[PDB]
Design a protein around this ligand. Structure first.
Ligand SMILES: [Zn+2]
Ligand SMILES: [Zn+2]
Lengths: 95, 116, 53, 144, 179, 101, 88, 166
């Protein structure tokens, strides 16, 4: 890799290779954790959010990137954050 | 520019070019029924002999989902800034004279396609 | 080489061809089974039940 | 009769030790192959970024093919030359080649150094899949 | 020479299946028939062919192919020998159930990892004790049969060493691995 | 730690504090704002950098990265990467908060 | 070229920078310059190989690998040559 | 290269960028409106054939538009009038004086593209110049001293055979 990386970039590229290693984030703000969570897949987001609940209200806009990739024909209705819509449609489609 | 097929409305057939010398202008007339219509564009027919220099408009964004296509992270998307993009050569019969690479952004909801 | 599934029958082959340049333009014809000559494709579409272009 | 009865005393064989080269020769062959693959990648990058100038009498794809085949033929020739230069006077492949009895320097080159480019109908291996020679490669892979 | 050929060892020629379960599933998995659509919807949609019969169009072909592969991998409605090809550039999905298609089993790769784990190998080491067989490995979604038309859309790792590769793996989107 | 500033001491509420080249801690964002604070010229030379809530091995990696990055930026070399352990990256990422890099 | 050793005395670690050949008590001198450590307080231990009584850095324990900016080589320290060897 | 251009067959198709068909009953007011100035300099069927030629093909064949125009006039004998200018290489063709003239101009445009020769010999598709480095196809001469001296001289190859014309 003929690239120079600062500490932010080093940590987030390593963590962008091993998202699966994250169990509990500790106390990192989402604004720091914004890159590694955008290159991610919704099951891993469910795992992260159900181990690290305090992130939930921060990550909802992230779910939109998933929703328009998995349910591109859809839009949220009112009183529907993107996480709960994605889980409702995901379980409805599996059923 | 190209000329397309203009269709009749009475029988939905093809309109053929014709002239009127009383008005001395150009009209597309239907010769199945008796419909006539004044023609907007004067160009009746055009050759595009060397107008194959463009291939970007035939590319679709769905090729971002092709797993057999080469992916690069050294050509970021201009429209949305996504780091990753697929690249490929042209698949036309006009690609015998060019190994030119075309790039498609692999981010969903963007689908931006460019060249070099 | 069209052959109906769920049955054992011979395959009927249809040839939708285009004439060469060497002719005002190059035209599309259809060689149908049990038809001696080539048929223009628009005639086949009209005989299918679609008269409008 | 006389030569066949002297060969009872002298003897002639071929073994797996006649297919071995020196470690320095193997390093030279690997270096030549690496350099030639780098050259092919550089020609690929020149053609991909539209920096490849066509030669007179040929189109761009055929000039690219000529350049790539020139690089790979130079690779095969240099690796083969190193292969024959490694050979001792006791080497039996070399004995049968310089006697003219059997084999050539191309055979020694393919046994010891590099088999070389595979050709079908005078060109490289065709894209029998959609723009792939095999499904183990990526599409539009023009590398060696 | 060349005209008389021989099978490879793990090559299997498909025996044929009825298209009816796949056709029913496509009918109520959001595919609209050809009889009920205006032609203006065909330009942006994906044509769906079942044994070469154009039966309809689909607006979301990627999740449809994901669903079809999930059905075939768990030996649901789609049986294992059915070939499903997405011509992505030409916007077509061709499903073949007929006989005579020569195919071979390939290990399934998801995110540069084999779905074959040590638990499958350990279960197969006692084939005549666990009653674990090759068919259980097919039903597990670990291996799947790919024919020549589908092989032209897969991305094969020659070995799992192609998967466990560093920053330039030459491909990060391997879909299958040679056994 | 000595006021002749080529060694600077820095503490993370742990026993294992660390003292590092200031010239090889030059790539810190926050060395320009809490050693180069409201006024330079012997604010820096105090060398009590009393950070909090960082485990010892984490900032050992961080300041070893400081020396690493200082001598591998603008030098003849530009390629090499930084081999962090995967778990500690999390808490190292909080160090990514502190140092503005 | 470089050198990378964590001069590790339990809870106090010194950083150094030097080249592939330097007398090993010049390390004590460069500790002495800022940390005010007399040579009695600078009993550097061994490496994994035994330490250098010949007093240069290109002698046993130190290779071209131990000058690693990726991760250095560490060993304990005792700030007394003969009396006591204090850890923590 | 001059001889190679004089031997290789050059149709109008090799040098034409595009041909378009227009309804222009009044050349005083050109509908395309990019050719207004030189047509008004010159100034008839209302049908117009506008031929745009590529720059590079018209340069490396060493063709000038007057040669194409006189080739038109020799080919049809003033059955049709062709004006031209450039400073885009623009030709404009009309047919002076039940098979309406649009399909007749269709047909003569097909004749333009296929059955007209600008320069060269008809049966020769491509000519490959080369300077031979071997003595098999060189010009061996006997010098004044009396040696056999090989002279490297440029020789041409063809892809068709029209030996007598060549
Ligand atoms: Zn009509
Ligand atoms: Zn984009």
């Amino acid at each position: 890799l003929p690239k120079m990386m600062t500490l932010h970039q080093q940590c987030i590229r390593v963590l962008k290779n091993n998202i699966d290693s994250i169990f509990e984030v500790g106390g990192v703000p989402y604004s720091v954790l914004e890159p590694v969570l955008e290159r991610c897949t919704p099951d891993q987001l469910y795992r992260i959010e159900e181990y690290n609940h305090v992130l939930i209200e921060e990550t909802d806009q992230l779910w939109k990137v998933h929703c328009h990739r998995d349910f591109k024909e859809e839009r949220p209705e009112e009183y529907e954050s993107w996480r709960e819509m994605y889980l409702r449609l995901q379980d409805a489609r599996e059923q | 520019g190209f000329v397309g097929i203009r269709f009749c409305q009475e029988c939905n057939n093809m309109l053929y070019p014709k002239e009127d010398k009383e008005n001395r202008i150009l009209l597309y007339a239907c010769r199945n029924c008796d419909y006539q219509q004044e023609a907007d564009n004067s160009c009746i027919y055009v050759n595009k002999i060397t107008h194959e220099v463009d291939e970007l408009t035939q590319i679709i964004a769905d090729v971002s989902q092709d797993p057999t296509l080469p992916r690069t992270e050294d050509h970021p998307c201009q429209k949305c800034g996504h780091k990753e993009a697929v690249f490929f050569q042209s698949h036309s019969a006009r690609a015998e004279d060019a190994m030119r690479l075309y790039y498609v952004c692999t981010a969903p909801h963007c689908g931006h396609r460019w060249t070099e | 080489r069209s052959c109906l599934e769920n049955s054992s029958r011979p395959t009927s082959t249809i040839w939708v061809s285009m004439l060469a340049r060497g002719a005002i333009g190059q035209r599309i014809v259809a060689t149908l089974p049990y038809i001696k000559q080539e048929v223009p494709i628009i005639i086949v579409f009209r005989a299918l039940g679609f008269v409008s272009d | 009769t006389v030569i066949n009865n002297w060969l009872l005393i002298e003897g002639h064989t071929i073994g797996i030790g006649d297919s071995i080269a020196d470690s320095k020769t193997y390093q030279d062959i690997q270096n030549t192959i690496k350099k030639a693959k780098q050259d092919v990648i550089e020609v690929i990058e020149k053609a991909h970024n539209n920096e490849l100038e066509p030669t007179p009498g040929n189109t761009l794809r055929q000039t690219f093919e000529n350049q790539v085949n020139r690089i790979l033929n130079d690779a095969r020739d240099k690796t083969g030359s190193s292969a024959q230069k490694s050979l001792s006077e006791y080497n039996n492949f070399k004995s049968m080649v310089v006697s003219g009895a059997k084999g050539s320097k191309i055979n020694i080159s393919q046994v010891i150094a590099v088999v070389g480019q595979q050709n079908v109908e005078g060109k490289r291996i065709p894209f029998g899949f959609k723009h792939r020679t095999l499904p183990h490669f990526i599409k539009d892979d023009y590398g060696p | 020479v060349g005209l008389v050929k021989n099978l490879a060892l793990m090559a299997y020629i498909s025996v044929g299946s009825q298209p009816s379960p796949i056709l029913e599933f496509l009918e109520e998995w959001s595919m609209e028939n050809l009889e009920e659509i205006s032609p203006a919807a065909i330009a942006d949609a994906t044509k769906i062919f079942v044994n070469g019969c154009w039966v309809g169009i689909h607006k979301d072909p990627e999740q449809l192919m994901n669903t079809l592969r999930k059905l075939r991998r768990q030996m649901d409605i789609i049986v294992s020998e059915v070939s499903m090809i997405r011509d992505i550039r030409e916007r077509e999905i061709r499903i073949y159930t007929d006989a005579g298609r020569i195919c071979r089993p390939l290990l399934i790769v998801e995110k540069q990892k084999l779905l074959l784990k040590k638990r499958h190998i350990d279960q197969l080491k006692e084939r005549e004790y666990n009653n674990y067989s090759w068919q259980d490995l097919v039903a597990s979604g670990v291996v799947e049969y790919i024919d020549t038309l589908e092989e032209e859309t897969v991305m094969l790792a020659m070995t799992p060493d192609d998967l466990q590769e560093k920053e330039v793996a030459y491909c990060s989107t391997y879909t299958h691995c040679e056994i | 730690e000595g006021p002749d500033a080529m060694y600077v001491k820095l503490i993370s509420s742990d026993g294992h504090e660390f003292i590092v080249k200031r010239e090889h801690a030059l790539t810190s964002g926050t060395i320009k704002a809490m050693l180069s604070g409201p006024g330079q010229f012997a604010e820096n030379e105090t060398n009590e950098v009393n950070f909090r809530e960082i485990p010892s091995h984490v900032l050992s990696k961080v300041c070893m990265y400081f020396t690493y990055k200082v001598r591998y930026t603008n030098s003849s070399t530009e390629i090499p990467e930084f081999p962090i352990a995967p778990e500690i990256a999390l808490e190292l990422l909080m160090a990514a908060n502190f140092l503005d890099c | 070229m470089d050198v990378f050793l964590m001069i590790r005395r339990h809870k106090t670690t010194i950083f150094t920078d030097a080249k592939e050949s330097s007398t090993v008590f010049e390390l004590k001198r460069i500790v002495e310059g800022i940390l005010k450590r007399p040579p009695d307080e600078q009993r550097l231990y061994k490496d994994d190989q035994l330490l250098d009584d010949g007093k240069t850095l290109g002698e046993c324990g130190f290779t071209s690998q131990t000058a690693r900016p990726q991760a250095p080589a560490t060993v304990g320290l005792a700030f007394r040559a003969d009396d006591t060897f204090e850890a923590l | 290269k001059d001889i190679l251009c004089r031997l290789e067959h050059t149709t109008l198709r090799k040098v034409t960028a595009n041909t378009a068909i227009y309804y222009d009953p009044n050349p005083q007011s050109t509908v395309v409106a990019e050719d207004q100035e030189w047509v008004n300099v010159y100034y008839i069927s209302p049908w117009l054939l506008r031929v745009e030629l590529d720059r590079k093909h018209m340069t490396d064949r060493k063709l000038t538009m007057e040669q194409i125009a006189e080739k038109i006039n020799a080919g049809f004998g003033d059955d049709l009038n062709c004006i031209f200018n450039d400073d885009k290489l623009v030709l404009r063709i009309r047919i002076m004086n039940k098979m309406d003239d649009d399909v007749f101009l269709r047909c003569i445009e097909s004749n333009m593209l296929t059955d007209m020769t600008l320069q060269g010999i008809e049966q020769i598709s491509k000519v490959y110049m080369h300077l031979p480095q071997t003595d098999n196809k060189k010009k061996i001469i006997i010098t004044e001293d009396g040696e056999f001296k090989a002279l490297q001289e440029w020789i041409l190859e063809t892809d068709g055979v029209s030996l007598m014309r060549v």
